[PDB]
Symmetry: D2
């Protein structure tokens, strides 16, 4: 299991923290470009999707321990501008999920794979699995099988399996139980998850300041259950920004880092203003980013370096007694 540990080390910074940036947005980027161009979403050229993902990778790489890129857009647009020492998490789940009456059904991106991600020099495989424990049996069986089959692929190619879990509405107190029980399920050893991309159990807006107050301790107990499931499974957990205001998301992180979270995954929030208001003027997008998005990014990174417990690689290698034992054992 060397590749999984080494792969996760390449996603964390020199200190062992996960200061990740998500740049795999497919419809969100297309929609942000439809607003910037003033044209309908169906008229936005592919060239525009590329120039936007190239600009974001150039702008946010030097302040990210690792970046999440999708294969069809960000990989051809910015693989040559992503620094070598920045970790590369490659998206595997297809954005066009099946919205059935009993819940959402996930599948991999066509003509892409865990094997291909390993081949292209990717450091980790990422899968977002829309999940809620109250889904129909058919939907629960589909999602569990999909996550499991990807976990098997990642074990086969010894590559870090990064599972992002998200609850959804069918086509606040209840939501917190739906989140925790989703985390508990995919923390089972059969799924082979190596890193959790988790959403907050309680909304960012509903969070009181960190204090000994009964209100704050009842909220911290929700985060504590998540952190307890992840420490027992041995899986580090980071947090999706979710679009919450920078201060609201900073509070989410203060609560999460107390319960044991090891980092964050920054989303749209960072650049959604710079892209919509200034594309295609590259220089103008970089100005709005250097004062808003990159500021928040450096702040979240500083909060992680201070409050978050660093992750450490767990290399419990077998006792290699003779020359050749390692090559045989690694099979």
């Amino acid at each position: 299991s060397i590749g999984k540990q080494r792969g996760l080390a390449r996603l964390a910074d020199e200190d062992g923290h996960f200061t990740m940036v998500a740049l795999d947005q497919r419809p969100p980027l297309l929609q942000a470009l439809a607003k910037a161009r003033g044209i309908p979403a169906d008229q936005v050229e592919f060239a525009d999707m590329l120039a936007a993902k190239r600009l974001l990778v150039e702008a946010l790489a030097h302040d990210a321990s690792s970046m999440l890129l999708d294969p069809n857009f960000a990989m051809p647009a910015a693989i040559d501008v992503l620094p070598a020492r920045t970790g590369l998490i490659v998206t595997l789940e297809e954005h066009r999920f099946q919205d059935t009456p009993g819940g959402r059904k996930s599948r991999s991106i066509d003509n892409w794979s865990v094997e291909k991600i390993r081949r292209v020099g990717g450091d980790a495989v990422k899968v977002l699995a829309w999940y809620r424990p109250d889904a129909s049996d058919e939907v629960l069986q589909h999602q569990k099988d999909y996550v499991r089959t990807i976990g098997a692929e990642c074990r086969r190619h010894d590559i870090p399996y990064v599972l992002e879990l998200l609850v959804y509405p069918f086509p606040a107190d209840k939501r917190a139980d739906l989140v925790i029980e989703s985390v508990r399920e995919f923390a089972k050893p059969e799924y082979g998850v190596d890193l959790y991309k988790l959403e907050t159990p309680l909304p960012a807006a509903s969070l009181p300041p960190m204090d000994d107050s009964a209100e704050s301790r009842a909220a911290a107990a929700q985060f504590a259950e998540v952190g307890s499931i992840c420490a027992d499974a041995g899986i580090p957990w980071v947090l999706l920004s979710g679009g919450a205001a920078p201060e609201q998301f900073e509070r989410v992180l203060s609560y999460s880092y107390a319960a044991g979270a090891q980092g964050f995954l920054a989303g749209r929030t960072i650049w959604l203003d710079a892209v919509q208001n200034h594309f295609p003027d590259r220089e103008a997008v970089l100005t709005a980013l250097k004062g808003d998005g990159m500021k928040i990014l450096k702040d979240l990174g500083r909060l992680t370096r201070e409050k978050a417990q660093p992750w450490k690689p767990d290399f419990r290698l077998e006792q290699v007694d003779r020359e050749g034992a390692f090559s045989c054992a690694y099979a």
Copy 2:
């Protein structure tokens, strides 16, 4: 192409220099540990080989762009202490070559492969091929087929093929042309070589200072032919220490960096005396390394920065104009 270019980017430092450290020594390290312990080479226990390679990774990994490690000894000994940002080149050649009257015959390490190197999260595959153009047709066709088969495996796994070429003496019971024709043959597109680990075409002691003189003009011309072959093929090249003294090896680099070379691969010079004179006192070995090998390493990196042309990853991406084309094309 993407995995090979990004893999190569992880072997060079931030600026694009290959300041690599060879740490895959098998018989030389065993012989260095025999002298350090008093006992003969056949009595050196496996635990000492691990202990030695772990000290050498801990003390040199931070002052190296990438490190070449062997699978059976260095992988289980120091994979946990190899920095995530330091590139990892894994040895594929079996050190026990066949010394036939007509030349040396090479093969891969048993139970180890290009596929396994891609799996552990290795950035590059290293193969040492013993080669003399004047070898027998049997030995020539054996070495050619072995190097070509590894290039095919490296192309299949889209991982950089780092080929090391060495000139050797024939079996003896009781110099520049041989290097240039070795470099020329394997530079052909059938071998798929991505990085060269070449030796100096003229001895290190024989090298005159870089003068306008016809002696230095004819000596630099030998390096220029090596550099022109590497440049026409598109294969960057690095120089291996090969036992030269600090000043002797620095002249080789001063000559090669003007001829095109993109860096160095430092070997036994850095730690041979530090190991042989102080093993197994860790505090003593690290002290000896700082005042000698580490000092040389710092000077070689400074010389590489002052005179070596930075290598650039040439991503010759076949332009994609639609969502799905990248996944389909990457096959």
Copy 3:
């Protein structure tokens, strides 16, 4: 190239003929089972699909040189009753194609791949690509890219690439023949890596006149000979899909095709549709209907192939090796 040659040899009988049977039908079998049960298709239990596939493999494996199985239904249903000597072709395309206004877009079955077909012991990979030369540039670009990416997967795993081409209507016999023939001409290009072709009739089965010395016959045979010519130049053997044509009509399509160089056929729905539809789940009554009709049709098709089809022969065309180690070094 060895694996593709051995794989192709295992899809044909020891004479060289492709007497193949298609058992990868997903919605057509679901509709047949809904009609047998007297319930809606969305009420058909998954166990009925397995019982049907298993019935059909045991029944038709006697008269078939190779069989086409789909991974999610046929493979769990009947891999244990598929004879070791009957070749195994595994379906890769998803039956749920994207029905865009500009044309149909294809994709692989989720969580199934060429690497898995090679791993499980499959002899060949099968992809059906919906194709029209006059479809939109985007749809054309998608289909060409999908076909080519599976051809690359098949070269990497050295396994035969069986490609089936089918024309369809968007959401004249000479106008259909142009759509069919120009589809064959495109995917015969070397970049696609096609090893075997599963083709529909360029001219309708009903329209075909008797194979005599008339002008009507030479005109019809010309379309078959253009298909036969494109395939012989590319080195791709071609078989014919029954496509729901009546037995007499399919035997006529085969006579025209075999004269043009076709090396066999792939029998679909025709063989078992009514048998399953009328008697499922009474296992015996299904076999009894199959023996009196479908199995008789397959025996006739196999006999016609033995007499009139040209035998496919393997051409290993291996580069000569002169030393021990050369073969292992060259196969990489």
Copy 4:
């Protein structure tokens, strides 16, 4: 597990019998051609090795349920004449074992693999592992690790793992113990053996007729032990000829089949005399292979259909109740 079961089905005849022919001989076939030409073993040409293996495949393939071919010699010589319906078993162990004083060390053929055997369309991988339970710990550990890593390769590529076990003399009733304890050791689930290729546990010449006698019962007890080990582990077993006389190998098979064996993997017994005597005339070798050599094989198959118990595939699959569960589970 599907590919393993179907691969075993393809090595057996329509009635589950293993009537296999081995023509992967490297040193034994070399010695036969050296004797046929008068010249030493070191003088036998490569073309002579190819022609001989091509004759055996043309002559015997139609009367064998499956054949065992080696990559370097029998594969380029006869893959084009090997019938589609004859199972192809491909050798993997290097014939040049390491003959240490403590015992024999095994390795795979250079540049060949289980991955390549799957790729060429081979139905099974074959490894011969030289074994004695009384060899040194260094040798026992090596053979154990080599057998185990190939089992893991065959599990990864879901391909039958045919393991041949052979006792040998150390350099420069007791035999039954070396044979039976070898069988016992590699029947352990960790090795992932799918089919056994075993030598007789009692010398072929020492065997009395198959009568209800004390001598017969004593010998049959050594065969029954092998049968029980194999039957408990669920591993079918076939007996290798070992160059024994035809009448002797029929007695070895009668005892083996009465104890549960499912066939044979006969080599030199069938064709050694045809090649050793009449090489290099094509018509003469094919006359002695179709008349005398094929008679032995035809008799061996006749005894097998009469007395050997059929092998039956256990396709005990994990039951699926929905569309997509097979593809998810097959990972």
